[PDB]
Write a protein that binds this ligand. Structure first.
Ligand code: HEM
Ligand code: HEM
Ligand code: HEM
Ligand code: HEM
Lengths: 141, 146, 141, 146
């Protein structure tokens, strides 16, 4: 579970993301596609080329959802219900892939928020992404 | 493989007693039931709404036999699984879009089916040799992903 | 989340285990040690040889805890508080390992409860071991 | 270890800019902080009760430097990691009893550390090369486990 400390950390680091969330979302996807090519099996229908608008479009969607979970940090299961349903029932992404994206999101943030990406913040952001992933996978079986 | 002559012989000898028809059908069906999300690739098979509907689905049983078939032939090239599954690796990547993680889920399901079937015969040492093969097979199949 | 069917399935299956749980505990460890030798790193102080009394004893211990968990299937978090503590603050076993013992446990049940190890029961037991795993690693950080 | 020449040049160019003393301490400290369970191996290091107590602990810094030291040597033998890491693999298994999953956690933390330090210079493609490298090293460190 996320502690008050964690919550503060997350709201703060995410606070700094601001308006770049969209671009950071797109970037985390590309990093993921390049480092863990097996994740590409879920986007057979996408143009995964560099600067793909589909990827841009998708990065924004992911970022909006994360931004929504930060806004509702005390009621994530409910704030993310719909997305939890979609993933469990339609997309059916294998659970192991959540950890891969999480990882790429952490790399992206680290690469953009050097002053904020402290050990303490890093730890909080990692527990956070793990919790989002848990929610999104909760209705799988 | 990093199979010991002794480990090779254990694998080889139990396999000889396997009904691929039955084990293939059961392994794939169990997969679709334990890990429901693997059903995403078999929508055209029909009603997989229940264990019963999965276990009874002929399309499932027949796909299961095809898969264990190929697996079975791979046990004859245990010293080059890579070269045996190369074409199948490309197919799975480029045509089917199957996440290699699925190969690992099945492997473990396979092991549970063998234990199920052979009871006593499926000893810790025999399971150990099989775990190495399933891992080996999964790796070979995932080898050509890009 | 364990459905009512699941809870039923589990209680049934474990019901048949009966006076053999200890032996099945011991057998599952032995299978884990041989199939996943990296797991042995947590038992440097044990004699991991076949039929070791240390392994046997430990087998009982684990089996017993599972029993207690089936019994309080409705309140696991509470029934295993202490165990969650021990693992999070003392043993500190890496989370990946729980999935390995869970698998060796299915294999063991399968090999001993042929009639009972149906596809639906298999699915339930898996979910159950998963839940048990979540409980035991919930206070890790 | 499928490092294309261009992947290998990229690993090597960036590694040129690293202060192993520094990166070593940061990577190890951060591991102990993000995945506190890993602190099980260092009860003789003293106070690891808070982030500052960990990050600043003279023992953690000195150990980090040692670790990254061995890793750097690894980077000069990308061709023979298994060979390079064999006595270390044995030691970690037989004497230290370190679960190999620890090697993968450290690799991921290291990647975040490099991102932290190089910012924009740590491009998607450079990360992908480093991902292959930390995995190759973790595999080499686990090769002698039994
Ligand atoms: C915390 C991590 C994740 C978040 C926040 C997230 C969120 C989302 C959102 C907001 C959408 C779009 C739904 C819509 O159409 O409104 C989506 C779709 C999708 N996601 Fe997830 N997701 C995550 C993890 C993953 C992972 C790890 C994968 C696979 C590697 C994945 C695969 C997909 C796919 C294939 C789609 C559909 C895209 C399309 O066809 O346009 N997701 N996700
Ligand atoms: C033991 C590992 C596996 C082996 C040896 C294997 C082998 C095969 C073979 C031999 C085919 C026949 C297709 C052809 O030649 O055109 C096939 C098709 C296919 N496999 Fe795999 N497979 C494995 C695992 C899996 C898994 C785990 C899944 C998904 C859960 C999967 C999904 C499929 C699908 C969707 C097809 C296409 C069948 C069709 O055309 O309807 N495979 N596989
Ligand atoms: C299925 C989930 C598990 C359950 C229910 C479980 C249960 C237990 C129990 C009941 C004890 C003994 C407590 C006592 O001594 O009073 C214990 C101790 C221990 N467990 Fe866990 N365990 C689980 C998973 C694991 C795994 C996967 C590992 C490592 C691979 C592990 C490593 C240990 C160790 C090293 C001890 C201490 C042994 C000793 O020094 O006597 N446990 N566990
Ligand atoms: C890149 C991966 C790693 C490398 C290259 C590496 C390298 C080393 C080296 C060179 C030593 C000293 C050898 C000696 O004492 O003779 C050492 C010791 C040690 N390593 Fe590793 N290490 C790695 C990862 C880890 C991790 C991730 C952990 C624990 C999470 C760990 C735990 C230890 C411990 C506990 C010692 C002994 C410390 C002491 O003197 O008390 N190592 N390692």
């Amino acid at each position: 579970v996320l502690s008050p400390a964690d919550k503060t950390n997350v709201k703060a680091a995410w606070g700094k993301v601001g308006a770049h969330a969209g671009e950071y979302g797109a970037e985390a996807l590309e990093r993921m596609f390049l480092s863990f090519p097996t994740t590409k099996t879920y986007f057979p229908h996408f143009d995964l080329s560099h600067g793909s608008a589909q990827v841009k479009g998708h990065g924004k969607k992911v970022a909006d959802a994360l931004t929504n979970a930060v806004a509702h940090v005390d009621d994530m299961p409910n704030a993310l219900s719909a997305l939890s349903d979609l993933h469990a029932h339609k997309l059916r992404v294998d659970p192991v892939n959540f950890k891969l994206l999480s990882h790429c999101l952490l790399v992206t943030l680290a690469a953009h928020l050097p002053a904020e990406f402290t050990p303490a913040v890093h730890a909080s952001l990692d527990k956070f992404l793990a919790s989002v992933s848990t929610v999104l996978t909760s209705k799988y079986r | 493989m990093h199979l010991t002559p002794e480990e090779k012989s254990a694998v080889t000898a139990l396999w000889g007693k396997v009904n691929v028809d039955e084990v293939g059908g059961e392994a794939l069906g169990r997969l679709l039931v334990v890990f429901p999300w693997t059903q995403r690739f078999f929508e055209s098979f029909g009603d997989l709404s229940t264990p019963d509907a999965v276990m009874g689905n002929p399309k499932v049983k027949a796909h299961g036999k095809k898969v264990l078939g190929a697996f079975s032939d791979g046990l004859a090239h245990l010293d080059n699984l890579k070269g045996t599954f190369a074409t199948l690796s490309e197919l799975h990547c480029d045509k089917l879009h199957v996440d290699p993680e699925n190969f690992r889920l099945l492997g473990n399901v396979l092991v549970c089916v063998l234990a199920h079937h052979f009871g006593k015969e499926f000893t810790p040492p025999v399971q150990a040799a099989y775990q190495k093969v399933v891992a080996g097979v999964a790796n070979a199949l995932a080898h050509k992903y890009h």
